[PDB]
Design a protein around this ligand. Structure first.
Ligand code: SAH
Lengths: 244, 7
């Protein structure tokens, strides 16, 4: 008759009545995003999202979340990428990310597209998800930089990549973290994130307050003394080192 | 490594 909340370090949570074994299994389980408001509500088995419908957390009463389902039929499921498949629904956006960021021309000279805040947010705010296919450090490190524009180290065994042609929003928009440009004076950082659709990935989180329509940037963090990096970054490392 | 954000 009791409800349980299980938080991840990133601030997302699973919430619901657990079954006889303390498992998040049932028809009224929810994943709640770190805004404590956007939710995916429905059928879960041992914490894995089978059918999550988009909802808004309207209140909690005695610890129990009360949701309203959003109109339409936006449904989501656990859909972890593989080495060759980025997503079963490449064009289905993440509903939390879609309210926080958009892609447009970067303000950085010659940098192509960039990622921008849709609204004003405070520090420590998760803005965007960096999902991609999962490949090895060996494959990535043993191939040319021209193929490594979007590679992100996840851990000691896995690199996340958004390979062509999925680097174009018309082909892939389920997540947008690969659209954030680099800065040596960034307003965001990469952080671990456990996503109900993508699984274990990284996210982009603000390290300070950001304004509406501000470009989001992250330090790519290439090794400066192995520099092991693409030319544009090396040219920029020089400039940045000068300003110091 | 030829990827972002390695430890
Ligand atoms: N500070 C910077 N200066 C110049 N180019 C940058 C940059 N940060 C990122 N880029 C560009 O962005 C690529 C990484 S992916 C970032 C999004 C990309 N601008 C796009 O339009 O899809 C790099 O290969 C480089 O081309």
């Amino acid at each position: 008759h009791g409800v349980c909340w299980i938080y991840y370090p990133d601030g997302g949570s699973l919430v619901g009545e657990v079954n006889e074994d303390g498992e998040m299994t049932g028809e009224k389980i929810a994943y709640v995003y770190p805004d404590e408001r956007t939710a995916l509500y429905g059928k879960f088995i041992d914490g894995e999202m089978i059918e999550g419908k988009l909802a808004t957390l309207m209140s909690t009463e005695e610890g129990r979340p009360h949701f309203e389902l959003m109109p339409g039929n936006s449904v989501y499921h656990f859909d972890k990428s593989t080495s060759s498949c980025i997503s079963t629904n490449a064009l289905l956006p993440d509903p939390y990310e879609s309210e926080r960021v958009y892609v447009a021309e970067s303000l950085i000279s010659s940098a192509g597209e960039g990622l921008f805040s849709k609204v004003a947010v405070g520090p420590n705010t998760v803005m965007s998800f960096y999902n991609g296919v999962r490949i090895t450090h060996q494959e990535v490190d043993s191939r040319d930089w021209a193929l490594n524009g979007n590679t992100l180290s996840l851990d000691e065994e896995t690199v996340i990549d958004v390979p062509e042609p999925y680097n174009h929003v018309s082909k892939y928009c389920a997540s947008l973290g690969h659209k954030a440009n680099h800065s040596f004076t960034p307003n965001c950082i990469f952080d671990m994130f456990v996503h109900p659709r993508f699984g274990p990935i990284k996210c982009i989180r603000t390290l300070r307050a950001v304004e509406a329509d501000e470009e989001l940037t992250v330090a790519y963090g290439y090794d400066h003394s192995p520099p092991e990096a693409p030319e544009w970054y090396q040219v920029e490392l020089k400039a940045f080192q000068a300003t110091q | 490594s030829k990827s972002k954000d390695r430890k």
